[PDB]
Amino acid sequence: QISVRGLAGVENVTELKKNFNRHLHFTLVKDRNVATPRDYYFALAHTVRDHLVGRWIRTQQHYYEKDPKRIYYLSLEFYMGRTLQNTMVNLALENACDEATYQLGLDMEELEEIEEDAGLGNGGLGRLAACFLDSMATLGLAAYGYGIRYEFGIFNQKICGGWQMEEADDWLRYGNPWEKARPEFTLPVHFYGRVEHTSQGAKWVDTQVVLAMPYDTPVPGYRNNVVNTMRLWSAKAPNDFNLGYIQAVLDRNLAENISRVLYPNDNFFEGKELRLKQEYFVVAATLQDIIRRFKSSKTNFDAFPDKVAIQLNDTHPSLAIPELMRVLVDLERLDWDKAWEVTVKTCAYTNHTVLPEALERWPVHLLETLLPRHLQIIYEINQRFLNRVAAAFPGDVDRLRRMSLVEEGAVKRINMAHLCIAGSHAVNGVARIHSEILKKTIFKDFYELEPHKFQNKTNGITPRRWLVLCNPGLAEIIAERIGEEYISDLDQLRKLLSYVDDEAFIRDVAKVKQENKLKFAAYLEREYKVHINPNSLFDVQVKRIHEYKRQLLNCLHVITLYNRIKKEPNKFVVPRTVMIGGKAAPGYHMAKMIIKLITAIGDVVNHDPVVGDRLRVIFLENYRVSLAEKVIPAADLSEQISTAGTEASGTGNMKFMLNGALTIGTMDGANVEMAEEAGEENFFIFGMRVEDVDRLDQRGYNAQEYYDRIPELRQIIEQLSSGFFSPKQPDLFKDIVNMLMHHDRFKVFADYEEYVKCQERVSALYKNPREWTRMVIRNIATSGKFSSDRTIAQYAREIWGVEPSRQRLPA
Amino acid sequence: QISVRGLAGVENVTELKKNFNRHLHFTLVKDRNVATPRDYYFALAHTVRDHLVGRWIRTQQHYYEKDPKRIYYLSLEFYMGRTLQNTMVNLALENACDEATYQLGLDMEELEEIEEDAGLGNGGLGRLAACFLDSMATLGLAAYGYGIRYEFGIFNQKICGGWQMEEADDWLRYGNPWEKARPEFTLPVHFYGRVEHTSQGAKWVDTQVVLAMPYDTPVPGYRNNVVNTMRLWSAKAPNDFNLGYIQAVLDRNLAENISRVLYPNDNFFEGKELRLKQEYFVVAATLQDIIRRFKSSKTNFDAFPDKVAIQLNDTHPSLAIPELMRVLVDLERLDWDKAWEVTVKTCAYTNHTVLPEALERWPVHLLETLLPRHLQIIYEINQRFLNRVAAAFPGDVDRLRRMSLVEEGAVKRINMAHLCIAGSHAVNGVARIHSEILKKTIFKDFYELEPHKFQNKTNGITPRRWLVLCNPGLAEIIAERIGEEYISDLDQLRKLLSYVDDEAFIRDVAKVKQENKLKFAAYLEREYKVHINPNSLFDVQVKRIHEYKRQLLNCLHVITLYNRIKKEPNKFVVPRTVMIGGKAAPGYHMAKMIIKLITAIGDVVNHDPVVGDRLRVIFLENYRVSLAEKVIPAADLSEQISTAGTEASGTGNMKFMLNGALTIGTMDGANVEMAEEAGEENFFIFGMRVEDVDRLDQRGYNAQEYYDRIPELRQIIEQLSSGFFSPKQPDLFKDIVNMLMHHDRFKVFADYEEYVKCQERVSALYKNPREWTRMVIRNIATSGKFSSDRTIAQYAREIWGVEPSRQRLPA
Numbered sequence A, B: 001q002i003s004v005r006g007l008a009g010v011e012n013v014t015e016l017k018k019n020f021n022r023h024l025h026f027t028l029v030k031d032r033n034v035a036t037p038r039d040y041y042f043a044l045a046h047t048v049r050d051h052l053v054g055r056w057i058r059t060q061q062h063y064y065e066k067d068p069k070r071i072y073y074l075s076l077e078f079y080m081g082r083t084l085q086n087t088m089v090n091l092a093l094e095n096a097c098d099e100a101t102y103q104l105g106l107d108m109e110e111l112e113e114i115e116e117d118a119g120l121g122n123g124g125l126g127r128l129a130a131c132f133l134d135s136m137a138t139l140g141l142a143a144y145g146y147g148i149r150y151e152f153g154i155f156n157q158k159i160c161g162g163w164q165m166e167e168a169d170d171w172l173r174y175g176n177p178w179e180k181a182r183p184e185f186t187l188p189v190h191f192y193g194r195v196e197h198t199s200q201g202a203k204w205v206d207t208q209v210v211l212a213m214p215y216d217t218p219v220p221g222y223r224n225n226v227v228n229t230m231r232l233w234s235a236k237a238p239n240d241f242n243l244g245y246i247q248a249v250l251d252r253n254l255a256e257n258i259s260r261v262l263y264p265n266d267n268f269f270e271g272k273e274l275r276l277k278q279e280y281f282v283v284a285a286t287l288q289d290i291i292r293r294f295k296s297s298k299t300n301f302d303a304f305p306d307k308v309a310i311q312l313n314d315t316h317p318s319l320a321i322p323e324l325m326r327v328l329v330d331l332e333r334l335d336w337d338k339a340w341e342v343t344v345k346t347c348a349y350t351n352h353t354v355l356p357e358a359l360e361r362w363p364v365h366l367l368e369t370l371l372p373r374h375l376q377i378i379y380e381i382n383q384r385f386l387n388r389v390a391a392a393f394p395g396d397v398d399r400l401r402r403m404s405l406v407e408e409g410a411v412k413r414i415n416m417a418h419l420c421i422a423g424s425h426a427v428n429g430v431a432r433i434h435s436e437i438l439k440k441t442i443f444k445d446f447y448e449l450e451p452h453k454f455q456n457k458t459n460g461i462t463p464r465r466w467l468v469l470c471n472p473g474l475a476e477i478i479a480e481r482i483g484e485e486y487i488s489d490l491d492q493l494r495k496l497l498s499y500v501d502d503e504a505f506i507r508d509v510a511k512v513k514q515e516n517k518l519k520f521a522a523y524l525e526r527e528y529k530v531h532i533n534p535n536s537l538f539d540v541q542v543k544r545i546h547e548y549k550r551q552l553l554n555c556l557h558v559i560t561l562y563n564r565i566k567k568e569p570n571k572f573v574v575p576r577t578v579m580i581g582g583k584a585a586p587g588y589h590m591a592k593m594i595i596k597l598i599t600a601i602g603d604v605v606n607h608d609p610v611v612g613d614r615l616r617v618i619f620l621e622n623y624r625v626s627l628a629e630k631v632i633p634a635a636d637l638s639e640q641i642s643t644a645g646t647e648a649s650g651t652g653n654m655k656f657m658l659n660g661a662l663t664i665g666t667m668d669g670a671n672v673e674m675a676e677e678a679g680e681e682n683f684f685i686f687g688m689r690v691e692d693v694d695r696l697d698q699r700g701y702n703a704q705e706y707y708d709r710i711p712e713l714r715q716i717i718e719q720l721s722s723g724f725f726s727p728k729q730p731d732l733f734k735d736i737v738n739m740l741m742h743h744d745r746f747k748v749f750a751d752y753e754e755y756v757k758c759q760e761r762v763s764a765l766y767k768n769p770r771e772w773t774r775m776v777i778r779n780i781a782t783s784g785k786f787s788s789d790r791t792i793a794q795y796a797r798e799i800w801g802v803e804p805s806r807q808r809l810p811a
């Protein structure tokens, strides 16, 4: 049908049809008379998987023969979404499969909707890992993703009476055709026990053993025949476990609970024992596998850093540092100093937030009981590190306190960020402003001691999933003008600046957006029975629910627009559909109240006859990767409105830019670099800068001042307090009003006036479709910097010491 | 190589080789350079499985079109063993696969050893279900086996310091290529709750729900292209289960524990709640599936018994009776009397033991809490049943007490056997003597009320697994004389009586036995580093460890032989290898002490220089179906020595007869019918008959009398007491001596003299190889009655009301 989706040759279609029929018969054990759409999905998935296997085997054989430096990306989260379409895209099979299924009387897009998301992450950090795997394969790096195979991923969100309800994400119920169990490579992991000192060093004895069983998933590069591996570990009890008899067998569940469920916290630290067990489990199994592969290569650990790089995705796998030391010192019998040199040169650390509540600080008493040898190693690392600090800054006693890996107080804790900096040769933030804030504030002391360690690597997104897959219409009109090479070299989108006055292109860009909006408007009615006006401006804020992300500021603007309409009903206003979506962590009360507020506003606004279809407020239920793929291409306006200095980068912002939405945002995270690329005239920037926030903090933030001086804001607060949005429960939102008025860490009121004014400027431009679209073209054209291919090429060259390759492996 | 294993045609071998290579590549994702023997096993299993699928689909399509009466065999146990060789045998693929693998440089028998047993049963009852499934498919019956998919089957037994240790049987660790998950046919099962009475009948409300997910395994008939289904249910929590958040997800384990593990009790009742849950889980899911299939056929439940038969394998699935009533009365709104008519005509019950401790008697308080509606139904069944008893036997108040389904006392209990008799149109024992004992003793009252219900169906074994598969050498020499038809018509073995004086045949029968013994002697050295003399008489007792089975009587004979050798070292004795094997239930202390005794005797006997290789005592570790397939063909002497009236049938006895061992046994269970078939002169019968046991009981059994009058027995008891077999722990066996002397329910001493004398007669015949073999031929020749094909044909005609068919389905 469309060019970017590849060829549908007679030979290929014929083979696909026959292999589809083979899988339905032999693999699924069904005939066409009894088969359901789900059976048809599985027959297609197995057919596509077959095309991966030869390339997968020969890629791994290639790495064994060539023996390049291997990259190990360690993460507790991989937010992969669906696999079928992505695999077809990267193998150039989409048009052929579309034709083959069409000829069998089936609709492929209907089959695609059957697949469960692999929802093994919370949000930005987990999705970053997923985009990174795609880019590493596309750039021919010998890269492996290592994590945990959670039985239950991020919960499914249902909205009941306007409230979030959580349901278990039983994603494996129908099986997972993509993974291959590798029970043959099962490895033991140790917990508890005690340390014995011999004349020949320390021994960790009397431990409990849990087995780590790997499952491998293929990661295809874009049309280069490279297939890398994501290896996820699953917890299993040994067979002599607890071995009255019945209870001992039932108690195996205790061991196997380690890989049962993803902790659903986004940017927040909960010091639970089970979470610590998960973090050690992934680190211990992964490091054994790395060492095994290194020894089987082609005794000398001096060359270890030449053949191995380990990237820590936040501090979650920080135990890799003392675990590597443990193995090298206790088991391989290296001297401390040599082991430490190897460790530092091997490990690098990526920081994802500056919010104090998100930082992992583990109580010493937990580590003492669970990982006694690791605590001893951490103490020794600390002692040697502080000795270097003391030598560099003699007499500076407070610096010693500030830099210690051990935090003193009521409960003694280990600061895992400090451990990561001490034990890594590179430390990076994830956008230019964030990386600067790290050096100036939270890690200033460390930057002074070791300036060479600190780097920036601005985040990116993969243009395969986030353009070609989710927005084929836009990909096609681009390819029609500039060819297909931009898909793996996104900087080529700059060539589109030559078409900003091209009447044909302007029309085509606008047509694709309208189609996407029509498709999404239909999706909503079909799946949720919710009506929307497809001619309205689609104003979208989708991301996890957090106070710092300021969904509440968006709510205030919505109520402002409603109040203005009620004041002057017969005045023209640009019609809007305001869509907000995202999950709240189950224990985060304020985030749950914010969801209730949004639905409560919708309940009033959507049923007011005077408003008509000029304003609609919709909460998008169960926001996840598959839903992002639908809503992002349909958006007109991207809301990126975090308080300056709080969102480290953002990546949702980049997805919207690539897909033809304009951005309203603060100068926060990557928004700064996006505006710099596109030009500030082509962005809707408002609000306090970081320096303005610092000034307000010095003075003291007083929310009452804003309430007193802004009558429109006063009205809204009075409406919330009095029960206008909750007539049955008049004091429902009192916690929200109280926080806003007395305890607001994120200064919602301070940006309100500038936000409302900026929103007026958005409505003004939307009234002029031609000029709206020209600004859109200027955004798409300068989105190239934000490809994760750029990001990974920078990690490769500046941290890992390897060169990317766009060259094909033989098919 | 050999005829009975089928053809190895060039076309077939070529196809098998290519499909083997395809599975290794695409299914296993391996190349030949990295593949292990386990990978090779899986490639072969998938290749053979492919041959099953077409026949499986078309068999089930055939039943839908023809709509015959369906047979549902309900069992908590299916002791299936390995599947690969059985599948090849029944499909006539063994020689072709042997050739194909040979050409790929692989040894098929080595690959076969990799497969885990499906050990989903304890012993005789579970293995009977497995032989039955094979016979039902071979006889073309539309039959379905329904049970539980235990994650952990019968434990693996390890012997450590002479003691039994138990290890979890993690049989699914590497996957199960034979099963197909059917998550689409998942059904809800209800527990707890309460009963509400409406104007329109009872309602069971406020229940907890557990999901039952089916897994289907193919059951191939012998060379008839029929493939039936065994459907096993697995427990899953609903997704809103317990839905702080983390704990609710972890607590799903509580629901899913229902299908976690097989209770390892053989002939013993433990009234645990989890076991009751298992019994209801299988019954509730199965009955819904039966009703669904009945409605989808081709409203009228009058024809239900014409289209459905349910066979209860013991009382374990007895809840089918009140569950069927519940569905018909509460949900389908039938009147009680009509529902009861349908229930009785649908259900039939097989009893497997008369031992009082094995009978299921559930405390009323358990049923009250777990299954409140079922208890109400059971009370109503009881009331109506006792009303009929009162009318038939007016004034007989004690009969009313004896026949009640409700047992009065300290703890009120429901007698499940009484429930089964009341609610079934047929009740059968499993051998002629057992069926007679039921009518004369434990169910006398019921037999008086309803004589027409009581039947006999003597047990049998499948000659596919228990001759062709495990003993191809014997199968081949038989086929050479009489053709191949006997494999599905075992009565044809009578034709062998014409060869009892044939010198060629006599030589061939003896040669096959020697080869089997050589193979087994080698297996022992290879796998267990244990040496045995292959020229000795192989004296074998393999079965679960129980006091009634009298492994202890065997032990006494062994010690007698040792003592006689020590007394007269230079006298000739026929050399023996005495092998005893079997598992003990983990909570059964005496059974564990018996295992220790056997190993302790071996420790003395096997290292006494004076004995030499004239006597060896070996405990066979981890007795299971796969081990039975090895040891049975190697045996010379089969020990079947239960106290008369205690072993209902036995089936191990029949396996030994078919494979060319002679039998030493009591007149118990099927031993009686075996001796009747072969002729008493061709059996080694000894000991008390049932009538002799009854006489001794009336008088009172005094073990001291035997100890006082038999000097050789006194010596043994004195050796056990004094610590001769446990020098480090002199009083180790005091519990055994005490039981024997004061509390022996099974009268070990009473049969000792006759047993020892009979054993002398065995040694006498073994000295004459030609006459030994002629007696063997007379046993094999008359083993035909003991085919499970005969047994199933009798169930079909006399209970289920269906005709068997030996006719082929089109391939």
Ligand SMILES: O=C(Nc1ccn([C@@H]2O[C@H](CO)[C@@H](O)[C@H](F)[C@H]2O)c(=O)n1)c1ccccc1
Pocket (backbone or CB within 6 Å): A122, A123, A124, A125, A126, A128, A265, A266, A267, A268, A269, A270, A352, A353, A358, A359, A360, A430, A459, A647, A648, A649, A650, A651, A669
């Ligand atoms: O902070 C935690 N978890 C975080 C932290 C940051 N992030 C996000 O990472 C993205 C990728 O770099 C950035 O674009 C965003 F700016 C950042 O907010 C995220 O998605 N989860 C956390 C802490 C303790 C326990 C669990 C999670």
Ligand SMILES: O=C(Nc1ccn([C@@H]2O[C@H](CO)[C@@H](O)[C@H](F)[C@H]2O)c(=O)n1)c1ccccc1
Pocket (backbone or CB within 6 Å): B122, B123, B124, B125, B126, B128, B265, B266, B267, B268, B269, B270, B352, B353, B358, B359, B360, B430, B459, B647, B648, B649, B650, B651, B669
């Ligand atoms: O009695 C129980 N479980 C039994 C009972 C009898 N049997 C056996 O069944 C074989 C097949 O008919 C016969 O050949 C044997 F004679 C008989 O002993 C057996 O293998 N398990 C039991 C009771 C409560 C709980 C669990 C098991």
